[PDB]
């Protein structure tokens with residue numbers, strides 16, 4: 652019987668990969684017409700999927716980069732129980748599988764990571780697992796901090812065994828409406844087991860910072876209620892990277908690449924300049 656996405660589309664008709672656990676991951680590619688100058692993997696956040704990066708990926712592809720992504724396990728069109736992961740390292744392992752496959756096909760090219768929220772924690776853990784392997788990282792409100800009250804709470808709830816208000820994601824109301832009606836987004840509350848894996852991700856990110864040397868661009872909104880801006884300042888201070896830059900968007904919420912047009916246009920421009928300077 653054909654393996655199908657959670658939306659019932661056969662994987663045989665879609666770009667995909669099978670991970671180390673035998674699970675099908677839905678893949679996306681945005682390849683330039685000419686020979687690519689670099690590769691870039693796009694790592695999405697919790698509850699979302701790779702299609703949300705369509706416009707950013709088309710901008711990167713226009714700079715002669717070959718952009719690629721997959722929906723993380725338990726997300727979007729990939730297999731797995733929704734927003735469940737046996738251990739957070741599965742996300743890192745699967746990104747390395749896809750990166751290694753692309754590097755086999757395009758040897759010699761520099762490879763960048765771009766990650767938002769949970770996807771940024773995955774990008775940090777990926778670059779920390781292979782020091783010197785990546786040319787750079789673009790982090791948009793990465794998940795690097797855990798609230799201590801939620802942390803102790805989830806540990807006790809896990810020893811025994813609510814959806815986010817979409818308006819906190821962005822000040823751009825049309826983008827909030829798009830988010831609320833995308834069938835590939837999981838807007839359900841956090842499962843206790845997955846909350847534990849996000850706390851593991853935060854703890855692992857803390858331990859990786861003394862070894863994190865990859866160049867990075869960090870974009871953070873000052874009014875982000877999901878990833879507090881304090882974490883972006885701590886990441887700038889604690890990462891060992893010789894090439895690190897922070898840009899703060901005053902008043903902006905969490906999803907900077909889908910924020911008010913003035914913020915989104917600046918985010919696209921800053922990522923373009925940063926990646927262009929490091930692929931020249």
Ligand SMILES: *C(=O)N1CCC(N2C(=O)[C@H](c3ccc(F)cc3)[C@H]2c2ccc(C(=O)OC)cc2)CC1
Pocket residue numbers: 696697698767768769770794796797801802805815816819845846847849850876877878
């Ligand atoms: C990006 O993919 N992410 C943004 C942050 C989000 N998140 C945490 O880091 C919080 C959390 C809580 C308990 C845990 F056990 C593990 C992680 C969770 C969260 C933060 C803020 C809110 C909110 O509504 O603020 C107003 C809801 C959830 C993970 C995904």
